[PDB]
Ligand binder design. Structure first.
Ligand SMILES: COC(=O)CCC(=O)N1CCc2c1cccc2C(F)(F)F
Ligand SMILES: *[C@@H]1O[C@H](CO)[C@@H](O)[C@H](O)[C@H]1NC(C)=O
Length: 348
């Protein structure tokens, strides 16, 4: 029910130079817009991007994209599946730039691949203004995994872009799902250490980060802005953070692969404690004590609860807060210390 549109500006491309695009389901009565950034890791040199092109080509190219996609979770148009924003205009932006949505570089005689993630978002926003976004009251930029980090890197640029295009009434907000990572010590050492790979990626991609964060960390240190707890305080747009306390991707880059003995037990408990600590001053957040990865486009996303409140409810309470609320909380972080100490955790 979401229909493919390739970008009219065909200079804004996926990795291999094919045009980027978006899937759109309009809702005629609605002034709410949901733009969702797909995730799927990244690549950061010629050799690992070549490998990704062999076996993950849909993440690098639009050549084989289907004409439609079915919206699931927060992208579902059915109230039964999506209590939050079922009647919104929905946009799914495929991740085909392998750059955590940060890149601003074209394929050229010096570049085998194009890394245009940041420009893809800008161009989607620009072309949507002629399809009804000009009349929007709220634009929620959402995303899972690398797309969740992409929200953090791009939400304020979308707000700046709309302001400079003459649309200061559109309220831009962010929803970052499973994109809030820690640059912590690995349980065992190896690469991968995400700090080093992101450092190399930014140079390979011509990656860009939000301006205030860039000005804090300065040249050569912009990799810091890919880490939510560092970039979030620099952002002006309201951002709701969704993060499993024991995220599978975090554990993977930490070289944890699950009878747990004391060293690993303490490692996992300390990871949950550190994640919880970084969310202490994030007023809008949903952080269940589960070992999982992504939530908001999963069909059963309504099932998990923190302190008896589901994520669709928390997001609705967030909406109300942006118009504390009795019985409508927006800060929901588990305090129990082990995966699945919350009984509503996904089953697998
Ligand atoms: C999956 C995925 O997309 N991941 C995992 C770790 C990560 C991602 C994306 C951006 C940044 C990071 C890092 F560097 F913060 F760990
Ligand atoms: C196409 O996109 C590029 C890169 O974002 C930009 O420089 C150029 O002005 C755009 N052209 C049109 C016609 O939108």
């Amino acid at each position: 029910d979401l229909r493919l549109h390739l970008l009219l500006n065909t200079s804004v491309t996926c990795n291999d130079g094919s045009p980027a695009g978006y899937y759109l389901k309009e809702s005629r009565g609605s002034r709410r817009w949901l733009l969702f950034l797909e995730g799927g890791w990244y690549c950061f040199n010629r050799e690992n991007c070549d490998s990704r092109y062999d076996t993950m080509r849909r993440l690098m190219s639009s050549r084989d994209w289907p004409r439609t996609r079915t919206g699931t979770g927060i992208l579902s148009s059915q109230p039964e599946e999506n209590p939050y924003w079922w009647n919104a205009n929905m946009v799914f932006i495929p991740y085909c730039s392998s750059d955590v949505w940060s890149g601003a570089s074209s394929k050229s005689e010096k570049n085998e691949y194009a890394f245009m993630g940041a420009l893809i978002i800008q161009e989607v926003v620009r072309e949507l203004l002629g399809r009804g976004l000009s009349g929007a009251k709220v634009l929620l930029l959402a995303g899972s995994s690398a797309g969740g980090t992409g929200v953090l890197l791009n939400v304020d640029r979308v707000a700046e872009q709309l302001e400079k295009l003459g649309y200061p009434a559109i309220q831009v907000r962010g929803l970052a799902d499973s994109g809030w990572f820690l640059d912590n010590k690995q349980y065992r050492h190896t690469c991968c250490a995400p700090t080093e790979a992101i450092r190399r990626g930014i140079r390979y991609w011509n990656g860009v980060v939000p301006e205030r964060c860039r000005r804090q960390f300065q040249e050569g240190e912009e990799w810091n802005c890919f880490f939510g707890y560092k970039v979030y305080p620099t952002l002006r747009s309201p951002v709701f953070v969704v993060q499993w306390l024991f995220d599978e991707a975090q554990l993977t880059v930490d070289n944890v692969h699950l009878p747990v003995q004391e060293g690993l037990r303490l490692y996992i408990q300390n990871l949950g404690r550190e994640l919880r600590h970084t969310l202490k001053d994030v007023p809008a957040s949903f952080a269940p004590a589960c070992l999982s990865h992504e939530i908001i486009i999963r069909s059963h996303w309504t099932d998990v609860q923190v302190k008896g409140t589901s994520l669709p409810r928390a997001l609705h309470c967030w909406d109300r807060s942006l118009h504390p609320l009795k019985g409508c909380p927006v800060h929901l972080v588990d305090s129990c210390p082990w995966p699945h100490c919350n009984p509503s955790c996904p089953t697998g």
